Amino acid sequence: MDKEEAKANAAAHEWYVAIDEKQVGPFNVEKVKDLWDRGEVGPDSLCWRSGFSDWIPLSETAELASVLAPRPSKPVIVAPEPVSG
């Protein structure tokens, strides 16, 4: 190999995710980007990180969209009452 995986900055991100009510291993923007792309991670599940005080779903924060390219899917309907608020 002529590159870095742990020393690289593009993949020097460490943040866990709430999956199946169980905490997952440390992921990176370079790793998740591939998972979320195919739907390997939890888009609607809460996401944590070093320093995070609480848990928040990626489907609520748009800051995760600019990083994780979303996938176009058919239209879906949701309940009248919100989940948070």
Residue 35 lies in a domain: yes
Tell me whether residue 84 is in a domain.
no
Structural domain of 40: 1-69
Residue 85 within a domain? no
Residue 54 lies in a domain: yes
The three-state DSSP-derived secondary structure of 23-38 is ECCCECHHHHHHHHHH
Within a 10 A sphere around the Cβ of 40, how many other Cβ atoms? 11
Amino acid at 9: N
Q: Which sign does the torsion angle of CA 25, 13, 56, 51 carry?
A: positive
PDB experimental method? NMR
Inside any domain, residue 21: yes
- Asked, for residue 30, whether it belongs to a domain, the answer is yes
- As a whole number of angstroms, the distance between CA 55 and CA 7 comes to 28
Give the chain's domain count.
Answer: 1
CATH at residue 42: 3.30.1490
The answer to the question of residue 74 being in a domain is: no
**What is residue 7's DSSP assignment?**
S
| Full DSSP string of 15-82 | B-BEETTEE---B-HHHHHHHHHHT-S-SSSEE--TT--S-EETTT-GGGTTTS-----------SS-
